[PDB]
Design an enzyme around this catalytic site. Structure first.
Site, PDB file in Angstrom:
ATOM      1  N   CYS A 117      21.677  -4.769  20.416  1.00  0.00           N
ATOM      2  CA  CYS A 117      22.140  -6.106  20.779  1.00  0.00           C
ATOM      3  C   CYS A 117      23.612  -6.076  21.168  1.00  0.00           C
ATOM      4  CB  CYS A 117      21.924  -7.106  19.633  1.00  0.00           C
ATOM      5  SG  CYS A 117      22.675  -8.727  19.914  1.00  0.00           S
ATOM      6  N   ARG A 120      26.520  -8.986  19.440  1.00  0.00           N
ATOM      7  CA  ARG A 120      26.711  -8.996  17.992  1.00  0.00           C
ATOM      8  C   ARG A 120      28.082  -9.491  17.547  1.00  0.00           C
ATOM      9  NH1 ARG A 120      25.124  -3.212  16.056  1.00  0.00           N
ATOM     10  NH2 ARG A 120      25.735  -2.631  18.195  1.00  0.00           N
ATOM     11  N   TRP A 289      21.984 -17.108  23.016  1.00  0.00           N
ATOM     12  CA  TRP A 289      22.088 -17.581  24.390  1.00  0.00           C
ATOM     13  C   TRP A 289      21.967 -16.377  25.300  1.00  0.00           C
ATOM     14  CZ3 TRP A 289      26.098 -18.685  20.868  1.00  0.00           C
ATOM     15  CH2 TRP A 289      27.157 -17.765  20.886  1.00  0.00           C
ATOM     16  N   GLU A 294      19.718 -10.682  31.922  1.00  0.00           N
ATOM     17  CA  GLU A 294      18.365 -10.781  31.386  1.00  0.00           C
ATOM     18  C   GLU A 294      17.473 -11.586  32.327  1.00  0.00           C
ATOM     19  OE1 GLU A 294      18.119 -11.279  26.891  1.00  0.00           O
ATOM     20  OE2 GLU A 294      20.086 -12.152  27.245  1.00  0.00           O
TER      21      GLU A 294
HETATM   22  C1  HEM Z   1      24.526 -15.006  20.477  1.00  0.00           C
HETATM   23  C2  HEM Z   1      24.204 -14.560  21.693  1.00  0.00           C
HETATM   24  C3  HEM Z   1      23.342 -13.295  21.911  1.00  0.00           C
HETATM   25  C4  HEM Z   1      23.339 -12.587  23.048  1.00  0.00           C
HETATM   26  C5  HEM Z   1      24.217 -12.904  24.285  1.00  0.00           C
HETATM   27  C6  HEM Z   1      22.414 -11.482  22.900  1.00  0.00           C
HETATM   28  C7  HEM Z   1      22.153 -10.504  23.866  1.00  0.00           C
HETATM   29  C8  HEM Z   1      21.185  -9.543  23.740  1.00  0.00           C
HETATM   30  C9  HEM Z   1      20.686  -8.685  24.792  1.00  0.00           C
HETATM   31  C10 HEM Z   1      21.122  -8.663  26.284  1.00  0.00           C
HETATM   32  C11 HEM Z   1      19.762  -7.876  24.266  1.00  0.00           C
HETATM   33  C12 HEM Z   1      18.990  -6.816  25.090  1.00  0.00           C
HETATM   34  C13 HEM Z   1      17.522  -7.228  25.188  1.00  0.00           C
HETATM   35  C14 HEM Z   1      17.036  -7.067  26.609  1.00  0.00           C
HETATM   36  O1  HEM Z   1      17.882  -6.822  27.505  1.00  0.00           O
HETATM   37  O2  HEM Z   1      15.803  -7.194  26.853  1.00  0.00           O
HETATM   38  C15 HEM Z   1      19.625  -8.171  22.859  1.00  0.00           C
HETATM   39  C16 HEM Z   1      18.763  -7.549  21.968  1.00  0.00           C
HETATM   40  C17 HEM Z   1      18.592  -7.872  20.630  1.00  0.00           C
HETATM   41  N1  HEM Z   1      19.197  -8.935  19.989  1.00  0.00           N
HETATM   42 FE1  HEM Z   1      20.828  -9.971  20.674  1.00  0.00          FE
HETATM   43  N2  HEM Z   1      21.847 -11.572  21.634  1.00  0.00           N
HETATM   44  C18 HEM Z   1      22.393 -12.677  20.989  1.00  0.00           C
HETATM   45  C19 HEM Z   1      22.069 -13.118  19.718  1.00  0.00           C
HETATM   46  C20 HEM Z   1      21.223 -12.495  18.834  1.00  0.00           C
HETATM   47  C21 HEM Z   1      20.800 -13.026  17.547  1.00  0.00           C
HETATM   48  C22 HEM Z   1      21.244 -14.415  17.040  1.00  0.00           C
HETATM   49  C23 HEM Z   1      19.973 -12.122  16.979  1.00  0.00           C
HETATM   50  C24 HEM Z   1      19.237 -12.158  15.614  1.00  0.00           C
HETATM   51  C25 HEM Z   1      19.548 -12.993  14.633  1.00  0.00           C
HETATM   52  C26 HEM Z   1      19.873 -10.997  17.878  1.00  0.00           C
HETATM   53  C27 HEM Z   1      19.140  -9.836  17.680  1.00  0.00           C
HETATM   54  C28 HEM Z   1      18.781  -8.934  18.662  1.00  0.00           C
HETATM   55  C29 HEM Z   1      17.893  -7.802  18.479  1.00  0.00           C
HETATM   56  C30 HEM Z   1      17.262  -7.503  17.100  1.00  0.00           C
HETATM   57  C31 HEM Z   1      17.777  -7.156  19.670  1.00  0.00           C
HETATM   58  C32 HEM Z   1      16.992  -5.878  20.095  1.00  0.00           C
HETATM   59  C33 HEM Z   1      15.822  -5.448  19.228  1.00  0.00           C
HETATM   60  C34 HEM Z   1      15.653  -3.955  19.359  1.00  0.00           C
HETATM   61  O3  HEM Z   1      14.892  -3.536  20.277  1.00  0.00           O
HETATM   62  O4  HEM Z   1      16.270  -3.209  18.544  1.00  0.00           O
HETATM   63  N3  HEM Z   1      20.656 -11.249  19.004  1.00  0.00           N
HETATM   64  N4  HEM Z   1      20.513  -9.206  22.571  1.00  0.00           N
HETATM   65  C1  LIG Z   2      15.398  -9.686  29.017  1.00  0.00           C
HETATM   66  N1  LIG Z   2      15.346 -10.636  27.886  1.00  0.00           N
HETATM   67  C2  LIG Z   2      14.232 -10.281  26.983  1.00  0.00           C
HETATM   68  C3  LIG Z   2      14.763 -10.133  25.572  1.00  0.00           C
HETATM   69  C4  LIG Z   2      15.781 -10.968  25.113  1.00  0.00           C
HETATM   70  C5  LIG Z   2      16.282 -10.827  23.824  1.00  0.00           C
HETATM   71  C6  LIG Z   2      17.375 -11.745  23.395  1.00  0.00           C
HETATM   72  C7  LIG Z   2      17.407 -12.279  22.109  1.00  0.00           C
HETATM   73  C8  LIG Z   2      18.434 -13.157  21.757  1.00  0.00           C
HETATM   74  C9  LIG Z   2      18.493 -13.760  20.371  1.00  0.00           C
HETATM   75  C10 LIG Z   2      19.414 -13.481  22.691  1.00  0.00           C
HETATM   76  C11 LIG Z   2      19.344 -12.920  23.971  1.00  0.00           C
HETATM   77  N2  LIG Z   2      20.289 -13.227  24.898  1.00  0.00           N
HETATM   78  N3  LIG Z   2      18.331 -12.073  24.295  1.00  0.00           N
HETATM   79  C12 LIG Z   2      15.755  -9.866  22.969  1.00  0.00           C
HETATM   80  C13 LIG Z   2      14.725  -9.036  23.421  1.00  0.00           C
HETATM   81  C14 LIG Z   2      14.142  -7.978  22.530  1.00  0.00           C
HETATM   82  F1  LIG Z   2      12.825  -8.038  22.625  1.00  0.00           F
HETATM   83  F2  LIG Z   2      14.562  -6.787  22.939  1.00  0.00           F
HETATM   84  F3  LIG Z   2      14.519  -8.159  21.275  1.00  0.00           F
HETATM   85  C15 LIG Z   2      14.234  -9.164  24.718  1.00  0.00           C
END
Ligand code: HEM
Ligand SMILES: CNCc1cc(-c2cc(C)cc(N)n2)cc(C(F)(F)F)c1
Ligand SMILES: C[C@H](O)[C@H](O)[C@H]1CNc2nc(N)[nH]c(=O)c2N1
Ligand SMILES: [Zn+2]
Length: 418
Positions: A117, A120, A289, A294
């Site tokens: 993520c 974070r 958000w 994405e």
């Molecule tokens: C606050 C704004 C946040 C943004 C801008 C953000 C952004 C992202 C992005 C771009 C990804 C990559 C997923 C993809 O490209 O398909 C991601 C993955 C992820 N996000 Fe964040 N996220 C946010 C908040 C959060 C929150 C609130 C949580 C959990 C409480 C979280 C947990 C995760 C997890 C667990 C993954 C990846 C799971 C994995 O495959 O290990 N995120 N996030």
């Molecule tokens: C291309 N978006 C798909 C995708 C988006 C997100 C995600 C989750 C959160 C809380 C914020 C954000 N901005 N994105 C998380 C995942 C996954 F599955 F990897 F956790 C996949």
């Protein structure tokens, strides 16, 4: 034993000691690196991996030691009695229950520890909704609506997670069958092609097999399919006034509105598993958000998703004969300019991949300073476009798995005893 990571754009060196506290395995060995396997064998929790009572207390102790260390009361009588209290409760029940304070710590640190993520930097500002008193799918529906309304906040988006009762026996399992709370339907056509989102074509059919009446169009918001205490899941429609959507327009190309694209504001992952102190929360929708890419890159331009590079370069009138004209690249940039511009002009929270990757480097410096490290998966942190013109491309990142954590889990329709 105190590994170094370098930024080759800035020559900055940071020292990682946090990886020493790591407990989980990564999938790599001394002789093979698995850092590009999408769902490594380790990153998954099957409902059969119910930690028995023997396994449960070390996990409980370990987590309790870092929680009390976090509030600067480590080793006190309060720690000792909580240690003893949970020990006694795992003896008595073969499981135990988290205090509300422990649930918020655990949830925030699962996010904090999510190496994939990039957002974070915000991990400590997360709103935890305790739904562990929920008992029915209707109650789940109610908690989730309240989550959507809270997190959406009229476009001023707020991070949040709703945590449903923890797994016990494994056959009484709370699950949100949706992969995200808000997703667009996907329908296969009589001519083979696909309407809406090809990702969800199987899930969309599952909703119809359970009775959904599909408006069979593009951006049809799916119904929630909620399973409570292991019972068969039931369909619910999020009140449309609660689903905020952004119509995508471009600040130069007036023909961009006629593409008729839109996207939902709230990204809310609902299929993952929250692990805290050995306890497994099978239903824990969390939302933040969007980073713009994405939507603009993956949702809109992945070959197997909405796949719009075709028509956008058409209307831009591009050299679409030659592969080497970078018409694909050219349309990709305009599409992502449009996504950002639409969300911003509508006051819906979004971050561009440049600001988000800068904040993550800054976040990384804080974690190495006041925590001794920051687990990070380069393969996921680098944005899917313009990689090397963002600072995270040049940043070395050590990936390791810390608990509390978010894990993947099998889609419930393959494990459910109907
Ligand atoms: C606050 C704004 C946040 C943004 C801008 C953000 C952004 C992202 C992005 C771009 C990804 C990559 C997923 C993809 O490209 O398909 C991601 C993955 C992820 N996000 Fe964040 N996220 C946010 C908040 C959060 C929150 C609130 C949580 C959990 C409480 C979280 C947990 C995760 C997890 C667990 C993954 C990846 C799971 C994995 O495959 O290990 N995120 N996030
Ligand atoms: C291309 N978006 C798909 C995708 C988006 C997100 C995600 C989750 C959160 C809380 C914020 C954000 N901005 N994105 C998380 C995942 C996954 F599955 F990897 F956790 C996949
Ligand atoms: C094959 C590869 O592991 C897979 O495509 C990964 C690569 N990196 C990614 N990075 C992000 N943020 N999101 C993804 O879906 C992926 N997919
Ligand atoms: Zn590796």
């Amino acid at each position: 034993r105190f590994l170094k990571v370098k930024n080759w754009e800035t020559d900055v060196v940071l020292t990682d000691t946090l990886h020493l506290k790591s407990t989980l395995e990564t999938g790599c060995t001394e002789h093979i690196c698995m850092g590009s396997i999408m769902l490594p064998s380790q990153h998954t929790r099957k409902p059969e991996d119910v930690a028995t009572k023997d396994q449960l207390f070390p996990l409980a102790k370990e987590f309790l030691d870092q929680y009390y260390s976090s509030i600067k009361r480590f080793g006190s009588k309060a720690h000792m009695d909580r240690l003893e209290e949970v020990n006694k409760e795992i003896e008595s029940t073969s499981t135990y229950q988290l205090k509300d304070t422990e649930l918020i710590y655990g949830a925030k640190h699962a996010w904090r520890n999510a190496s994939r993520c990039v957002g974070r930097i915000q991990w400590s500002k997360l709103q935890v909704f305790d739904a562990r008193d929920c008992t029915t799918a209707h109650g789940m529906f109610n908690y989730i609506c309240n989550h959507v309304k809270y997190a959406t906040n009229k476009g001023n988006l707020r991070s949040a997670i709703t945590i449903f009762p923890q797994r016990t026996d494994g056959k009484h399992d709370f699950r949100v069958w949706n992969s995200q709370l808000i997703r667009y339907a996907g329908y296969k056509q009589p001519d083979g092609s696909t309407l809406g989102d090809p990702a969800n074509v199987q899930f969309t059919e599952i909703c119809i097999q359970q009775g959904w009446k599909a408006p069979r169009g593009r951006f049809d918001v799916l119904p929630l399919l909620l399973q409570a205490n292991g019972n068969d899941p039931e369909l619910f429609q999020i009140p449309p006034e609660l689903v905020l959507e952004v119509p995508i327009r471009h600040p130069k190309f007036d023909w961009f509105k006629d593409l008729g694209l839109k996207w939902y504001g709230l990204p809310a992952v609902s299929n993952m598993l929250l692990e805290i102190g050995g306890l497994e929360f099978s239903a824990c929708p969390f939302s933040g958000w969007y980073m713009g890419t994405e939507i603009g890159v993956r949702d809109y331009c992945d070959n197997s998703r909405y796949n719009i590079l075709e028509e956008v370069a058409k209307k831009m009138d591009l050299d679409m004969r030659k592969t080497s004209s970078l018409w694909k690249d050219q349309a990709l940039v305009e599409i992502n300019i449009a996504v950002l511009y639409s969300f911003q002009s509508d006051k819906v929270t979004i971050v561009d991949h440049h600001s988000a990757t800068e904040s993550f480097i800054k976040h990384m410096e804080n974690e190495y300073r006041c925590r001794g490290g920051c687990p990070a998966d380069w393969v996921w942190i680098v944005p899917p476009m313009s990689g090397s013109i963002t600072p995270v491309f040049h940043q070395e990142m050590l990936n390791y798995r810390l608990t509390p954590s978010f894990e993947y889990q099998p889609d419930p329709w393959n494990t459910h005893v109907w």
